[PDB]
Each structure stands twice: as C-alpha cells, then as structure tokens.
C-alpha cells in the first residue's frame, strides 16, 4: 500500500505486525531513510518509539548537540533526536503516548496532538488534549522550549536541566522528567511522572511514542 512508509502505522498498514526495528522514509522519500523502533502491539500498534528508559546503562545527561542528533540504540535505551522528531511530527498530525511501568504496575498518558518546532525555535513542545491512566503531567510543559545542561532556555533562575539531572522542555521546572537520572529517588532528579508516582520515585521503564492522529 505504501511503497516507502513514512511511519510505523504505514508499515502496519502494509501487513507488518511484529514490533522491532524498521526503516521509515520521511515524507515517503527513499533518500530520507531513518531507522526507528516500531511498537506494533500497544493500543493497536503503529507507533514510532522515540525515547526509551529501561535499565540505566545509557547516560542521558548529555548536551544540546547530542539531543539534537540522537543517541543510543533504538532496541535498548535511546533518544531519537530532536531534529528527527521535528521532521516526523511535521509530516502530519501525530498523537503522543507515554507508556510507563513499575514492576507489574503500568500506566499511560496520551495526547491527541504532538509536535516539536525546529532548531531555530528551540524545539518548542506542542501537545493536544489528554486521556489516560497516568495523569496529565505533560500539559505543564505546553509551549516550552527544550533545554539541556549546556543550553538553559527555561524560566527558572536556576538551570533546571543541571539541577534535575536531565534534558527537557523545562519551565520552573517540571512535572515530568523522563530524560532524568535513572534510579534517582532524590526529589525531582529522577525519571518522574508526577501524577503517577510523584517526584521521589524514578520510574524504571518508560517509552515515548507517536502515531498519526486517529489511526
Ligand atoms: Ca534558567
């Protein structure tokens, strides 16, 4: 159906049902290949996973350049890269899902719009309306630029990314911190999703993922 799938939903539509690594072609262009991890099972499948935490073996306390280009293994812990996320979210309207787990407990948050702006606009976050079980901890970050420890774009007098061991669309400073320090229970420094587990619990497994709206 789609000779050059531009996301995981188009792969799913072609008949590919197994989660794993797929090439997607941005704007359907053969020359714009990007390797991604497709979640083909959650809520019907078709998701591009663009962030994962699961074991703490990958350092996330990186700099702007690293968050721009991406790092990590898409089969393990990684960040797809802010330029890539901007390009994907510019090719249509995407929804965001955040899946989180703590042992046998699980929760999710979904937003019916998701985009980041370009480099010049500091990758500002845009999210739609919320539904789910984890609580809405991301709307606090609506409209905010991205910040890293070496590039403070937040509206705190402090450096949020340095103080809270992360990289995020910080304001003053956060309700979620999913690029924070793995396993870190000190208040607001770990992998927090406030409305699910507060600021003194670091979530051991999180995935951030996106699929075309109303798929
Ligand atoms: Ca600041």
Residue numbers in the entry: 1131 to 1345
The authors write:
PNNs are a condensed form of neural extracellular matrix that include the glycosaminoglycan hyaluronan and extracellular matrix proteins such as aggrecan and tenascin-R (TNR).
The Fg region of TNR includes a single Ca2+ ion, and comparison of the bound and free form of human TNR(Fg) indicates that formation of the complex does not induce any significant structural rearrangement. Interestingly, the Fg domain of TNR matches closely with the one found in the lectin tachylectin 5A (RMSD of 1.7 Å over 210 Cα positions) in spite of only 46% sequence identity at the amino acid level. Furthermore, the major contact site in TNR(Fg) overlaps with the N-acetyl-D-glucosamine–binding site found in the Fg domain of tachylectin 5A, and the amide group of Q369 in RPTPζ(FN) occupies a position identical to the acetyl group in the bound carbohydrate. Consistent with this observation, residues in the major contact site of TNR(Fg) are equivalent to those that interact with the N-acetyl-D-glucosamine in the lectin.
